[PDB]
Design an enzyme around this catalytic site. Structure first.
Site, mmCIF file in Angstrom:
data_model
loop_
_atom_site.group_PDB
_atom_site.id
_atom_site.type_symbol
_atom_site.label_atom_id
_atom_site.label_comp_id
_atom_site.label_asym_id
_atom_site.label_seq_id
_atom_site.Cartn_x
_atom_site.Cartn_y
_atom_site.Cartn_z
ATOM 1 C CG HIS A 251 31.332 47.095 31.394
ATOM 2 N ND1 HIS A 251 32.282 47.085 32.391
ATOM 3 C CD2 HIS A 251 30.919 48.382 31.270
ATOM 4 C CE1 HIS A 251 32.417 48.310 32.866
ATOM 5 N NE2 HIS A 251 31.605 49.113 32.206
ATOM 6 C CD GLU A 252 28.997 49.690 28.079
ATOM 7 O OE1 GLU A 252 28.251 50.553 28.560
ATOM 8 O OE2 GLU A 252 30.220 49.718 28.294
ATOM 9 C CG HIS B 137 26.812 50.574 32.744
ATOM 10 N ND1 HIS B 137 27.193 50.971 34.010
ATOM 11 C CD2 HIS B 137 27.928 50.633 31.978
ATOM 12 C CE1 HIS B 137 28.491 51.232 34.010
ATOM 13 N NE2 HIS B 137 28.965 51.030 32.794
HETATM 14 ZN ZN LIG Z 1 30.977 51.075 32.220
#
Ligand SMILES: [Zn+2]
Length: 413
Positions: free
Chosen positions: A227-228, A231
């Site tokens: 998830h990171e 980003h």
């Molecule tokens: Zn996030």
């Protein structure tokens, strides 16, 4: 060359190649005066692990229990976490193990390769792409800078909430104008926040007829890290959508938050059901913004390059262009394809499906659940190939993520 992950022990000696003492990227900010330098390990080309607490922004500078009202009722605080060599080595091993997990499926390997190769667009000096602190970290020894080494991503331990995870882009204009920026991630492989999901395969009272109910699960910290990493990918391409909110009531983008809204960057990064009905208007605007930003950079910056160096090679691999030196143009079709992969295909929910990891249905959780501790270094609990859902132990099909599993240890809070 096949992607490998460099292994390390925390006590490995400084070599100036993969093991350094790093000056904080945010060293110039007043709150970081005198901090570091910190031992850092190059796990993959341009990807560094720093076994220290993340405390380099306004909201992470104080690791104590917050002096204000708390933002998250599922937070856990311990200012002493990660201050011993043994905890730092455990962290280092945990991050390495999670990265080995991510690399073990092609989608995860490709994500890591993308982060490794997708340098921010450098500034131009004397006709050459030339490195800045937006693309490097400094190896500091005895108050002297020995070298500036390339870095796209620096992974630290958690900030004040030891079960929280976050990504921070270094420079706020490059994060969203198409240039891209080095990212820092604060990650906690051992302290996890559970979630609810409906499920039927668990030990149940015989008097309950309908077994399919909401059950508690721990996340796979590889999913959390991925998830990171999504980003980070947005940040490296300079396409972050941090300053827009999606309103679920209207299906429109807004500049400010509303009652039933979600930051658009999180909507896309998480994916899942909530991103399946985004309007064509929204998608067209997002694409146009990125295309315009890239067209501007190709004209105003890339076409000022008169020196063909390795940085230009890396940028041509990152950014699909046509034409020759001084007269490049965006390769519209290839750019659109790559952009739509990084925005709409790359997300936590899709990646989790490829890894047979259970994730929650919505980015926003309906209720707080107390964090747990889990020693993911024990292969009986968590393996690189299967995470918690280990087939040989009968834990396939998400069963290993069930929160009642013994390896998810209760924390006294
Ligand atoms: Zn996030």
């Amino acid at each position: 060359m096949k992607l490998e992950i460099n292994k390390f022990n925390y006590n490995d000696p400084i070599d100036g190649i993969n093991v350094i003492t790093m000056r904080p990227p945010r060293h110039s900010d007043k709150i970081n005066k005198g901090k570091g330098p910190f031992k850092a390990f190059q796990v993959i080309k341009n990807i560094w692990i720093v076994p220290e607490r993340y405390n380099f922004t306004n909201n992470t500078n104080d690791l104590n229990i917050p002096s204000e009202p708390i933002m998250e009722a599922d937070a856990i605080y311990n200012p002493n976490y990660l201050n011993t060599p043994s905890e730092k080595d455990e962290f280092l091993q945990g991050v390495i193990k999670v990265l080995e997990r991510i690399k073990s499926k092609p989608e995860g390997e490709k994500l890591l390769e993308l982060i490794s190769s997708s340098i921010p667009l450098p500034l131009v000096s004397n006709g050459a792409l030339t490195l800045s602190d937006n693309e490097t970290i400094a190896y500091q020894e005895n108050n002297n800078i020995v070298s500036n080494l390339q870095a796209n991503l620096v992974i630290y331990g958690p900030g004040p909430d030891i079960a929280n995870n976050a990504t921070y882009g270094l420079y706020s204009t490059p994060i969203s104008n198409g240039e891209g920026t080095l990212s820092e991630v604060s990650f906690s492989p051992f302290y996890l926040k559970p979630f609810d999901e409906s499920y039927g395969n668990y030990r149940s009272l015989v008097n309950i007829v309908n077994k399919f109910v909401k059950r508690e699960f721990a996340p796979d910290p590889a999913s959390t890290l991925m998830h990171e990493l999504v980003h980070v990918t947005h940040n490296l391409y300079g396409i972050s959508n941090r300053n827009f909110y999606y309103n679920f009531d209207t299906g429109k983008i807004e500049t400010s938050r509303q009652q039933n809204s979600l930051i658009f960057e999180e909507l896309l990064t998480f994916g899942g059901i909530d991103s399946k009905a985004i309007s064509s208007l929204i998608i067209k605007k997002i694409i146009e913004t990125a295309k315009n930003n890239y067209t501007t950079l190709i004209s105003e910056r890339l076409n000022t390059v008169t020196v063909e160096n390795d940085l230009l090679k890396y940028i041509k691999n990152k950014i699909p262009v046509q034409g020759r030196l001084g007269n490049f143009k965006l390769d519209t079709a290839e750019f659109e394809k790559k952009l739509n992969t990084i925005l709409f295909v790359l997300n936590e929910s899709n990646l989790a499906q490829r890894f047979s990891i259970l994730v929650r249905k919505h980015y926003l959780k309906e209720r707080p659940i107390d964090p747990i501790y889990v020693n993911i270094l024990d292969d009986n609990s968590y393996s690189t190939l299967e995470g918690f859902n280990i087939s040989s132990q009968g834990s396939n099909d998400f069963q290993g993520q069930l929160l009642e599993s013994s390896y998810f240890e209760k924390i006294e809070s």
